[PDB]
Amino acid sequence: PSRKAKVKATLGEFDLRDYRNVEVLKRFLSETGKILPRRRTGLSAKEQRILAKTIKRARILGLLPFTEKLVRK
């Protein structure tokens, strides 16, 4: 069911526009650098259109990765 836990509840509050909040914005990527599908995140219609141009910001400034490779795990 993909019914693990969306990342909206696994945190206190925060701002979606503070690019270098990388503790949080690591849990909005995958085991690739891919911005988590809206179903995983559980973000609003506004919210993940914001968190979109955020991790596109906090990428150019190196902080958050463009892609990874893969752990067979």
Binding site: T67, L70, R72
Partner: protein, 115 residues
């Protein structure tokens, strides 16, 4: 020639072939092999039993240089992709970590007609 403890396994699985070049912690070609070197001539080469075979004859040239440990890397989705991966755990070689890193554009080149 020389001796090497830890070395890393590169696997390139196409459709018309599957290729294993094994190296050292830098990425330097110790021994390499694909199905077409095993004896396979045409469409023969892509079979999952060819991938099992390259990841033998390549991992055999590599114990010839005394190979102990391997980490694996794989490039593609192809016939018997993981059949070689297994063909290495089954050759007598510690499989460290196993990684996939497929060439993935972010949309640059228009592919050929045949998409």
């Amino acid at each position: 020639k020389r001796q090497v403890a830890s070395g890393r396994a590169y696997i390139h699985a196409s459709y018309n072939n599957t290729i294993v070049t094994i190296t050292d912690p830098d990425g330097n070609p110790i021994t390499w092999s694909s199905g077409g070197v095993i004896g396979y001539k045409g469409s023969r080469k892509g079979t999952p039993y060819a991938a099992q075979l390259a990841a033998l004859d390549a991992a055999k040239k590599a114990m010839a240089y005394g190979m102990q440990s391997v980490d694996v890397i794989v490039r593609g989705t192809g016939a018997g992709r993981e059949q070689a991966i297994r063909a290495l755990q089954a050759s007598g070689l510690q499989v460290k970590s196993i990684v996939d890193d497929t060439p993935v554009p972010h949309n640059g080149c228009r592919p050929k007609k045949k998409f």
